[PDB]
Amino acid sequence: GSHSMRYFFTSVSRPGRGEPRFIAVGYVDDTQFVRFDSDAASQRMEPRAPWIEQEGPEYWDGETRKVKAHSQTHRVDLGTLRGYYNQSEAGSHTVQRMYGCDVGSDWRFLRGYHQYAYDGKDYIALKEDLRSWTAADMAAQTTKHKWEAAHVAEQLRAYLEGTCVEWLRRYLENGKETLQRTDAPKTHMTHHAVSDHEATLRCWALSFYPAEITLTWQRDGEDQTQDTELVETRPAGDGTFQKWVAVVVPSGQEQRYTCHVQHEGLPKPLTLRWE
């Protein structure tokens, strides 16, 4: 199926002394593969997956130079935005940037993206066509004008449709043993009595990859949303993911209820029942 490469960058200003805290992370699909943290000792881009260790010293020197350049743009941005919004030097502020590309089952370019936020609110984003910009307010509009005069969109489009796609394909090949492998959810169901009248059924999905999954309940063959609780999908810590969904039912009626699991690692969706 489809794949993605995405980079995420956060800078947080430190009023009173020194430069902002800067943290960069890179992902292929749901797998982290690189990081840079300005508070760490190395001041280098670091590997976070075994398959990226295949890359030579020139790659690591080049990514390091680029990630530091990213960090310096963010430092400057924090000063400019404080000016744009007439804010003081006292408070801590945040910039966030995300960019990357998607490819379909044929590993050809599908979509590209590049978005930016200031203090957790939309600031400016490249549109889907990769030709123009969405500016949220009048500050972002000034930036839009700057970037239009300098043809920034043109530079990004070239990266997102070219280099991004090229290197994602490269990563997918080098990391094929994990990156191109699906792990099906390991499912089971638990039971709790709340009182003499009421029971909780909880349907578990564990050890799955990628993160995308659907868990639903049915009663006598029809979808049930009322009296259900579905937790956010959460990392196990070993590269795989976890999720559950629970339903509250009248004691003795457990048999009416079935849990249904959809995941790319399952050719057929699966059904579970109590007892």
Partner: protein, 100 residues
């Protein structure tokens, strides 16, 4: 400034069995700004050897982090996660429930 309160889940990496080495996780998400305090607790006491993931964020720009430590469950020992953030008046404590 937008302020978003963290959601918290506490759970083990693998199915929990006494005497068998495992990892205790505290997943914090949906928060803003990024400054956050997270402790794992053993019988009320702060665990010293705790690592965390590199800061990242969702589509809506809210942050998430995973805090984790190696542990061997026993019948008697109680575990929890203690979170403080600008949006919280008192630290929030969530107990690990293995029977879930």
């Amino acid at each position: 400034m937008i302020q978003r309160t963290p959601k918290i889940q506490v759970y083990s990496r693998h199915p929990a069995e006494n005497g068998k080495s495992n990892f205790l996780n505290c997943y914090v998400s949906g928060f803003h700004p990024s400054d956050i305090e997270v402790d794992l607790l053993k019988n009320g006491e702060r665990i010293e050897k705790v690592e965390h993931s590199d800061l990242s964020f969702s589509k809506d720009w809210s942050f998430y982090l995973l805090y984790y430590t190696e542990f061997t469950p026993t019948e008697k020992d109680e575990y929890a996660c203690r979170v403080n953030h600008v949006t919280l008046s008192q630290p929030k404590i969530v107990k690990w429930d293995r029977d879930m």
